[model samples]
Target: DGTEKWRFKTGKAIEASPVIGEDGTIYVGSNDGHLYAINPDGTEKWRFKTGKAIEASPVIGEDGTIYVGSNDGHLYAINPDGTEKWRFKTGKAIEASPVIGEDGTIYVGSNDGHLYAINPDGTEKWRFKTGKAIEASPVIGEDGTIYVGSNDGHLYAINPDGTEKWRFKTGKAIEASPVIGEDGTIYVGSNDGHLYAINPDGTEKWRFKTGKAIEASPVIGEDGTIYVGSNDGHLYAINPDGTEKWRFKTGKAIEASPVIGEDGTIYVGSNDGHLYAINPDGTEKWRFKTGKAIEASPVIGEDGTIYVGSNDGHLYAINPDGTEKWRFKTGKAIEASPVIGEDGTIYVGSNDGHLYAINP
Candidate 1:
């Protein structure tokens, strides 16, 4: 738990994650239909109005420009000083996060069933239609290929030049984002209850199956061990070769992803209102109960403080040993994953329409 440092109220609830600016300023979108910039001291720097509520998290370009998408079916490029630099419109609402390419290109998916590639100056390079809505964020490979999951039950790999590299079919809709391994294997979850590992050449490497649908994305450990959660109320750990390593039981579905701690403990949250710490061997380390569902993921401070939000309208800071450090209260529930700044200021948003800045 932590003490309140400052708060900036919006007009409505917030579900977007807060991004740390280059200058340590906090930038985040809100369901209130605006993107806000707040100083480290909690004062408002600027707020850019969007056409509709924003759920996508904004990413800062190398040139200090902020790019974000809104439910209003548009992607906006705003200058660091809060002025609108430019905007590119998609055919439908956009809920996916934007990815900036090495050459400063922007890649974002939309409900229009297409992924739009835009240049830095707001001109469209190319667009790829997937025949289904894309809610998952785009991930770029080391070689500059774009990977995205769609509701159409396929994972499409697009080259940097907006060309189709290949597409791998899945069993069901895929709203979860894909993760790339060290060897260029793509791991993505699907509503059909399986995690597919696709090779760099678009061929199926292997798959791990679970009972319930998987909305939670998978994470690779320091040793290539994969950890993922499912709605069946269990956390599955798979070997690098697609074999089962271990599985941990939870009280409810785990929508949040697991985070690896410095000491090799895996921290994860569940709808059961508990944040669990598990050893790499799949043994229980400890569990801290919260007031409501813990849907948002946890972020660790450099000093090992685990900060996470809950539907109970509170952000908790727990020690690495499974004890409470402190907790900060808000007017509404917090679904956004918390972000930590260089100066140690933790920023988060709440459904109560307020963005909070707290120092631990």
Candidate 2:
């Protein structure tokens, strides 16, 4: 097991994801209305205050700038040193994460029913209006197209120029983000209890049915198998041809995405307060229990150590064999996902309004 490295405190809850910069600094937002940048050793580098709660995760640009949105209807660009570069005001709150394009453009969705593309200098490149709020993050295709889902139950593909390429309607709202496969196929889930594989041209390639709503995103394995979770408490492994390869049942609903280990083991969390490690063949390897439900996704270190957060107010580090390596306790629940640095440092946030940097 590792040691308790260090801890820093903030003001409220943290539902946003933590991201590490090239310099090893960790950035994450909290409902406390502040974004904290912490050193790898757990010391505070700087803190940037916002107008409202920040549930959207911060994304780093090619030039070292940090981009994040707030529930106060603003997207901010902060410099590496924590200075404010620019802030773009939206019409409503922003719960979706921001994504950076290859050309340095920032793509983020807003609850005001719009997806915005902003330039590196904080200028607006274009905007596309949707029928409802967007909680799902945007994913860019190999051909420069932007894909995002909306609460209106539609998946939209927008061209580089901000024009609508196509829109696919579903049974219900989509809270999950979209993931692109190696072949440019878009994989996304809907509350309609379905996982859709859309072709590059926006046509439906196939659809895999689930028992309940799917708020979790899908991840593709090296062998092209699609792994996703359902609210029905099952993690499904579907083949490239849309047939079920296998499914592993959990104790509760799964809102967390699956992360594959170096050996192809699938790791995911459940509302049952367990983090499960499953073999590629759909058999359970092991499970680590926590004090409360787990809604955060797991991240695997280069050495195969797993990092995940739980609503029980702890971030756990488990070995490849599912043994507890260490756990950093917090003042409140941790719904934010953990991010691992190149040096094996773990960065995670908690509802206690703090961003932690743990040395393993």
Candidate 3:
């Protein structure tokens, strides 16, 4: 049980996730062509304006800098107090979020089929070109290698200096991202409904087939199980050796991955308007009721409360007992999770084009 803290209106729908900083600064990019920095107590701190829309979640550097990519083909770096640091002009609009390198290099992808590596001072380090545009976020392997996929139906492994080490092809375009396990095995899901394990040398590995396509990242569990969801309404747990460990079914396609709590309870939502919690061994622990569908995963608070949003134009907060702690209603559907700020405030976006701040 909670109440509304505040609501910040935006010009368009809010699909981008919020990035909150220490000391309670909430940074979020809205489709309104601005990156809003709100104070912890629900007032506008400052906003950086950009041309076109800014939909990608802003990246925060280690030093509290904000990095945003506008559809106008510019990646702007802003300081904490909302002053402009610098801007790196890309060949096209950037959709993928930027990943920082150990040496302070910024790696980001654009619609122009190139990954621009920018220096910390906003200078161009190098830009590696693929055969097609890239939408998936780039992942940095344990060895500092950058692995990314593009619309050209290929996954590329590149060195830190921007040279391609090797590339692997897929049956269809890759929309899902890859995850690195403890063994350095690169796991990815493709639109062809195949999950792959690529060896460190970029060789074809074992594969597991799902009934329909997958469009989300494959999550690795603590002991090496691959957890992924498919459009066929089934969530599967696969062993690293490419065998199915268990499968759970829903009424329709699953939009996101299951989130594991500190106590090992797997919480996930479905198109059937129910949120189910399962034990680690694939047994159902409990199920919570909701509206018609749930698109976002659950967010765990410090005290083990689950905060989530559903398509019923509401956000629900549940306790560890799987009971409704509180629910906040918005004008339209909530599409993103309720991000917990440093001061324990809840931040999320609504399809009604508003950003909400709730005090849990």
Among these predictions, the greatest TM-score belongs to: 1
Better of 1 and 2 by TM-score: 1
TM-score of each candidate structure, all chains considered together: 0.98, 0.96, 0.95
Candidate 1 local Cα displacement, residue 248, angstroms:
0.5
* 1-360: candidate 2 lDDT, tens digit per residue: 455567677788778888888888878887888888888777889999998998878888888998989989999999998899999999999987799998999999999999999998889999999999989889998888999999999999999999999999899999988999998889999999999999988899999999699998999999999999999999999999999999999999998899998898899999999999999899999989998899878888888888888888888889999889888888788887787778776777777776667788
Model 1: number of clashes?
5
Clashes of each: 5, 1, 2
State in Å the error of residue 219, model 2. Answer: 0.4
Of 1 and 3, which scores higher on TM-score?
1
Ranking by TM-score: 1, 2, 3
Q: Rate residue 170 of model 1 by lDDT.
A: 90
Model 3, 219-260: lDDT tens digits are 778888888887887888899888889988877777777788
Angstrom error of the Cα, residue 95, model 3: value is: 2.0
Candidate 1 whole-model C-alpha lDDT, 0 to 1: 0.92
Clash pairs for candidate 3:
1-325, 1-326
**Cα misplacement distance, residue 101 of candidate 2 (Å):** 1.5
